[PDB]
């Protein structure tokens, strides 16, 4: 009749308050009140800590587990390494057959901006920014023209699309690539435009429709978390089919799924499915 | 365990069911599709844990629905599906006794 997991079967010195059953000794009414308050505070803190541990996400749990696993009793100091093993390697490209040259990151000084690009990829044509001609005409936006160029290329059954290069457009392309609606994308470090390789399935196109949220840059739309969750809720059934792009206050272009997951609301960009 | 669902065949009364009065009999009820209904106390013999509450957060489509519109304009006789009634008799009966 042996047991496991407990080296001492029982504690001779360790007893119980109820087992002792000694006469209750109270210092005073103030002491009783202080004891009640401190024990209820301890219980509340324990409950809150337990709830937080339950609510801790998987990423945090795995990071904490790895940290404690690799923990050392001594805080080891960093060592000197080679001149560089931490540089961000440039993405591969073919110099001969290319839409644009993959300009390396060491020329960040030479790089310009979307409005005033520097002279590069002169062998190719340059995408001119859309500009309204009259007041009545809608104020076009890079998101709008990117969406319409992608839609037109999809309808005309094209492979590569040259689209304007902004942070929001690159984030939208990255999200579409993550969701698989786009075969791939590449941000050649050209100030004006980058490349997107489309995807087709069963002769038709895997992208059904793309629509920018706002036609004018003058009007700006904000998406509340409830308005985002209404998209997920489809007459009582969870639905992640249609994809919505939002840009938050942290300059992080995400999708409505992650926006709902972290309970944040950013400005909308486009709807694609 | 399935709770007692509201807006059912037996829960709803006659006017809410068909906008007409039917006799409320414990037996011989062809309309309610039952033979004999001897009625004990609702939750006496049944186990307590089997009683899980009730649910009424929906719309009774026969009784009340959103956007009550006419199904088809012509003929004018037909109306929304919420109204299912039989033809009204003419000169039903008269009572000689004053009362």
């Amino acid at each position: 009749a042996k047991v496991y997991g407990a080296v001492p079967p029982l504690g001779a010195a360790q007893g119980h308050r109820l087992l002792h059953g000694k006469r209750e000794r109270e210092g005073s009414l103030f002491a009783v009140a202080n004891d009640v308050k401190r024990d209820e505070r301890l219980l509340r803190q324990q409950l809150n800590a337990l709830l937080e541990e339950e609510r801790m996400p998987m990423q945090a749990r795995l990071q904490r587990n790895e940290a404690v696993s690799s923990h050392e009793a001594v805080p080891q100091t960093p060592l000197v390494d080679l001149p560089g093993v931490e540089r961000r390697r440039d993405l591969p490209a073919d110099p001969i057959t290319r839409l644009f040259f993959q300009h390396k990151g060491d020329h960040a000084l030479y790089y310009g901006t979307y409005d005033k690009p520097s002279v590069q990829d002169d062998d190719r044509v340059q995408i001119e920014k859309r500009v309204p001609r009259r007041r009545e005409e809608n104020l076009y936006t890079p998101i709008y023209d990117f969406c319409h160029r992608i839609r037109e290329a999809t309808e005309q059954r094209k492979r590569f699309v040259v689209v304007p290069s902004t942070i929001e457009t690159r984030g939208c392309a990255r999200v579409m690539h993550d969701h698989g609606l786009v075969a791939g994308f590449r941000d050649f470090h050209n100030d004006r435009a980058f490349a997107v390789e489309l995807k087709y399935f069963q002769g038709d196109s895997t992208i059904n429709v793309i629509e920018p949220c706002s036609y004018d840059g003058r009007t700006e739309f904000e998406w509340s978390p409830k308005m985002m969750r209404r998209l997920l809720n489809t007459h009582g059934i969870h639905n992640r089919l249609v994809v919505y792009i939002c840009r938050t206050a942290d300059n992080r272009i995400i999708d409505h799924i992650h926006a709902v997951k972290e309970n944040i609301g950013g400005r909308g960009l486009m709807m694609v499915h | 365990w399935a709770p007692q669902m509201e807006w059912g065949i037996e829960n709803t009364p006659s006017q809410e069911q068909y906008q007409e009065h039917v006799p409320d009999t414990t037996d011989a009820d062809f309309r309610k599709q039952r033979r004999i209904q001897s009625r004990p106390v609702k939750w006496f013999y049944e186990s307590h844990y089997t009683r899980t509450g009730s649910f009424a957060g929906f719309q009774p489509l026969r009784f009340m629905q959103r956007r009550t519109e006419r199904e088809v304009r012509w003929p004018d006789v037909i109306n929304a599906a919420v109204q299912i009634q039989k033809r009204k008799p003419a000169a039903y009966i008269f009572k000689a006794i004053p009362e």
Partner: protein
């Protein structure tokens, strides 16, 4: 579960209600004489798991005399190796002063109680002919000396299982097993009403007033397609009538 020396040696594990802390015993004597199981007091704090449902480790924590010499704490879950159903208990925790459980070098002399036995399949061993029937305490309603055959004959047993021709064979109770995928395929399920689990699968019969004209038209002009509501009825000009529980993926017919 093994028999040696005339008693049942069972190995099990006792775990907290949230199944965080667990202590497994390799051998325990199944003793029906004890009303409820007894555990050492030292295990109280080694099984106290302050979960969220229970702010304290145990829902019930009181003191009893078996003078207030033991602690009743629980609930605590218990998994017997030979049992497929967990048993939840409120065992006695006894200090060393009232009772020393250690007997040999590493043996705690833990004996399982009647409350734990009656909740698992070992209760069947308390019936006549069981292993614990000989160790049941003296009572006028049980005589351990007499044999199982004698007890069953007293209760009414005359012959063995289904020896008489009148009683049917026990193995003839179920001659067939109904698995849809192994014969005739799945079922053609329909409904009339709001929801598939709300309406009924019975389509209205051929006697409906809205269907009689269509049925008559079909009977007259059987060689054409007649428009109407009669197609919704269970009567169809095709030999396969639309009735509940019809196998439509079956090879034949």
């Amino acid at each position: 579960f093994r028999m040696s020396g005339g008693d049942m040696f069972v190995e099990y594990k006792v775990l907290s209600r949230d199944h965080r802390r667990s202590i497994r015993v390799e051998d325990a004597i199944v003793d029906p004489t004890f009303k409820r199981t007894v555990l050492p007091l030292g295990w109280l704090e080694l099984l106290r798991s302050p979960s969220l449902r229970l702010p304290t480790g145990y829902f019930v924590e009181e003191t009893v005399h078996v003078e207030a010499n033991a602690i009743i704490a629980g609930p605590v879950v218990l998994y017997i190796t030979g049992q497929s159903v967990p048993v939840v208990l409120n065992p006695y925790f006894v200090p060393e002063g009232t009772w020393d459980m250690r007997t040999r070098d590493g043996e705690l002399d833990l004996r399982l109680g009647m409350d734990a036995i009656e909740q698992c399949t070992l209760f069947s061993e308390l019936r006549p002919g069981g292993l614990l029937y000989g160790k049941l305490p003296e009572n006028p309603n049980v005589r351990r000396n007499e044999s199982l055959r004698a007890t069953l004959g007293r209760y009414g047993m005359k012959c063995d299982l289904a020896e008489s021709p009148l009683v049917p064979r026990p193995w003839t109770r179920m001659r067939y097993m109904f698995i849809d995928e192994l014969q005739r395929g799945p079922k053609l399920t329909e409904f009339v009403g709001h929801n598939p689990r709300n309406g009924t699968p019975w389509r209205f019969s051929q006697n409906t007033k809205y269907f009689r004209i269509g049925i008559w038209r079909d009977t007259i002009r059987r060689n054409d397609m007649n428009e109407g509501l009669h197609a919704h009825s269970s009567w169809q000009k095709s030999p396969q009538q639309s009735v509940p529980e019809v196998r439509f993926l079956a090879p034949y017919p």
